[PDB]
Amino acid sequence: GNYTTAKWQPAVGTKWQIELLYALNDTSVDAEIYDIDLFINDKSTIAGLQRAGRKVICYFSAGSYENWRPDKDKFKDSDLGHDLDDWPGEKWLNISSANVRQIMLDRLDMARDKGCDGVDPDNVDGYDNDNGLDLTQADSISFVNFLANAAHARNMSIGLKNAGDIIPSVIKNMQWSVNEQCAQYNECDTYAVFPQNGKPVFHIEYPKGDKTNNDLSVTASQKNAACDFAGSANFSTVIKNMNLNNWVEYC
Ligand SMILES: *[C@@H]1O[C@H](CO)[C@@H](O[C@@H]2O[C@H](CO)[C@@H](O[C@@H]3O[C@H](CO[C@H]4O[C@H](CO)[C@@H](O)[C@H](O[C@H]5O[C@H](CO)[C@@H](O)[C@H](O)[C@@H]5O)[C@@H]4O)[C@@H](O)[C@H](O[C@H]4O[C@H](CO[C@H]5O[C@H](CO)[C@@H](O)[C@H](O)[C@@H]5O)[C@@H](O)[C@H](O)[C@@H]4O[C@H]4O[C@H](CO)[C@@H](O)[C@H](O)[C@@H]4O)[C@@H]3O)[C@H](O)[C@H]2NC(C)=O)[C@H](O)[C@H]1NC(C)=O
Ligand SMILES: *[C@@H]1O[C@H](CO)[C@@H](O[C@@H]2O[C@H](CO)[C@@H](O[C@@H]3O[C@H](CO)[C@@H](O)[C@H](O)[C@@H]3O)[C@H](O)[C@H]2NC(C)=O)[C@H](O)[C@H]1NC(C)=O
Ligand SMILES: *[C@@H]1O[C@H](CO)[C@@H](O[C@@H]2O[C@H](CO)[C@@H](O)[C@H](O)[C@H]2NC(C)=O)[C@H](O)[C@H]1NC(C)=O
Ligand SMILES: *[C@@H]1O[C@H](CO)[C@@H](O[C@@H]2O[C@H](CO)[C@@H](O)[C@H](O)[C@H]2NC(C)=O)[C@H](O)[C@H]1NC(C)=O
Ligand SMILES: *[C@@H]1O[C@H](CO)[C@@H](O)[C@H](O)[C@H]1NC(C)=O
Ligand SMILES: [K+]
């Protein structure tokens, strides 16, 4: 068995919340799992959630350079590829680089030290984008399994962010999927293999679109499009703003 094990395996259907825009300042949402930013949340916030019986997944970008992070200066010029979408503040990483991999180990150390129960590593799908580094599916598979073994070695769980094409090659090392918008793009069957194997899909839809963020609701039709799909009863769906601030609705 060329995989490592995690002690925390959340159940299919576990209710969750995700808030990545700012330091978490709303724990009123009755969700068992909170996915929050690794860097901008402190140990006391994470422990406070766990004291309330919740599990904390710590988000970070494993496949992109973000120019606002406190470790941004660790990255070398040779680690960086093309902009994610025309802004140099976020760039694709050479995920095969020893230096990139060591930075991600440093970030996993931080997650462990802060008490994170699991980690949610973003942008492991450079192969499906204009990355400028000839990234491949095999590169992501190697990288994701590297991240999973490193997280498990630090007693943390991990999951696959989108990247549906590589599911067969990493799923044994994953404790969940985080999916965005499979309902909008006719791909939820791809991700349904996770609950078929006892693992949740933490599922996000963005019905207000990519330019509107507010605390107001969506239509019943937009809610039904996000919520009702084959096997959706096994997906842990949240309806969110694209900016992933506090606001959330549940199915
Ligand atoms: C958890 O933490 C987060 C993060 O700290 C909290 O969210 C933050 O809350 C702050 C305080 O409410 C907000 O500050 C206000 O920002 C208003 C516009 O901000 C724009 O620019 C910022 C700058 O970067 C930007 O970040 C914003 O982007 C976000 O929103 C857009 C959508 O708009 C998203 O697309 C995006 O992704 C971001 O999420 C945004 O674009 C700014 O106008 C405010 O200054 C106003 O208002 C203050 C109070 O407003 C009150 O006015 C009436 C007066 O009668 C009052 O009755 C009412 O209750 C209002 O609350 C006031 O103090 C200021 O002096 C100023 O007033 C002047 O302007 C208004 C017109 O708007 C006039 O009426 C007035 O007479 C004056 O002329 C604030 O600076 C942060 O934006 C917000 N940050 C984010 C990321 O959301 C969150 O609340 C926390 N949650 C909990 C539960 O605690
Ligand atoms: C461990 O080693 C394997 C083999 O060397 C790596 O490749 C992956 O192996 C799995 C075997 O389970 C393949 O999985 C899938 O099998 C089922 C059939 O029931 C189905 O979903 C597909 O037919 C699919 O092939 C997977 O395709 C294969 N991937 C590649 C790129 O060869 C695997 O990546 C290594 N690591 C882990 C964590 O498994
Ligand atoms: C991304 O990083 C990897 C690892 O640093 C680079 O792959 C190496 O390339 C050199 C040739 O320049 C070979 O000698 C090594 O054997 C390669 N290592 C591996 C693991 O394949 C790769 O070239 C980098 N990609 C880009 C676009 O610079
Ligand atoms: C590693 O993670 C596991 C799982 O979260 C931790 O085990 C938990 O420990 C607490 C406190 O003793 C118990 O209340 C839970 O029932 C345990 N959960 C499971 C699934 O075993 C463990 O403490 C963490 N640390 C180490 C060093 O293993
Ligand atoms: C959800 O998963 C369980 C166990 O994997 C399965 O028996 C059940 O049929 C699934 N539900 C739906 C609606 O597909
Ligand atoms: K995204």
Q: Where are the domains of the chain?
A: 1-251
Q: Is the dihedral of CA 153, 108, 18, 178 positive or negative?
A: negative
Q: How far is the CA of 72 from the centre of ligand 3 (A)?
A: 21
Q: Which residues contact 229 (CB under 8 A, 6 or more apart)?
A: 182, 183, 188, 235
Task: Please give the Cα distance from 98 to 134 (Å, whole number).
Answer: 17
Task: Please give the Cα distance from 103 to 70 (Å, whole number).
Answer: 12
Task: Please give the Cα distance from 151 to 161 (Å, whole number).
Answer: 15
Give me 20's structure tokens: 């990545």
Helix and strand numbers (H, E) in the chain are: 7, 13
Per the DSSP assignment, residues forming a β-bridge with 18 are: 35
Give me 67's structure tokens: 């120019």
CA-nearest residue for atom 27, ligand 3, is: 133
CA-nearest residue for atom 34, ligand 2, is: 169
Q: How far is the CA of 208 from the centre of ligand 6 (A)?
A: 15
Q: To 5 degrees, how large is the angle CA 45–CA 51–CA 57?
A: 55
**Do residues 73 and 66 make contact, with C-beta atoms less than 8 angstroms apart?**
no
Q: How far is the CA of 242 from the centre of ligand 1 (A)?
A: 17
Catalogue the E-assigned strands of the chain.
16-19, 33-37, 55-61, 64-66, 80-83, 90-93, 118-122, 157-158, 160-161, 177-180, 201-205, 235-240, 248-249
Task: Please give the Cα distance from 2 to 173 (Å, whole number).
Answer: 9
Task: Please give the Cα distance from 204 to 200 (Å, whole number).
Answer: 13
Question: Resolution of the coordinates in A?
Answer: 1.8
CA-nearest residue for atom 4, ligand 5, is: 196
Task: Please give the Cα distance from 122 to 62 (Å, whole number).
Answer: 5
CA-nearest residue for atom 2, ligand 4, is: 155
Q: How far is the CA of 24 from the centre of ligand 4 (A)?
A: 24
Ligand 3 proximity of 94 Cβ (cutoff 6 Å): yes
Task: Please give the Cα distance from 241 to 212 (Å, whole number).
Answer: 7
Catalogue the E-assigned strands of 44-136.
55-61, 64-66, 80-83, 90-93, 118-122
Q: Which residues contact 124 (CB under 8 A, 6 or more apart)?
A: 62, 63, 95, 140, 143, 144, 147, 160, 161, 162, 163
Instruction: Give the closest ligand to the alpha carbon of residue 162.
Output: 6
Ligand 2 proximity of 219 Cβ (cutoff 6 Å): no
Residue 251's nearest CA partner among 11, 27, 59, 13 is: 13
Give me 213's structure tokens: 């963020």
**Do residues 174 and 166 make contact, with C-beta atoms less than 8 angstroms apart?**
no
**Ligand 5, atom nearest to 234 Cα:** 1
Q: How was it solved?
A: X-ray
Q: Which residues contact 117 (CB under 8 A, 6 or more apart)?
A: 8, 50, 55, 56, 57, 156, 157
Instruction: Give the closest ligand to the alpha carbon of residue 12.
Output: 5
Burial of 236 (0-12, 13-18, 19+ CB in 10 A): buried
Q: How far is CA 59 from CA 157, 193, 199, in A?
A: 12, 23, 18
Q: How far is CA 51 from CA 55, 56, 73, 138, 232, in A?
A: 9, 11, 35, 40, 30
Q: In a mutational test of the pocket of ligand 5, which residue from 234, 235, 237, 251 has the highest number of ligand atoms less than 8 Å from its CB?
A: 234
Give me 75's structure tokens: 């990255």
Ligand 1 proximity of 212 Cβ (cutoff 6 Å): no
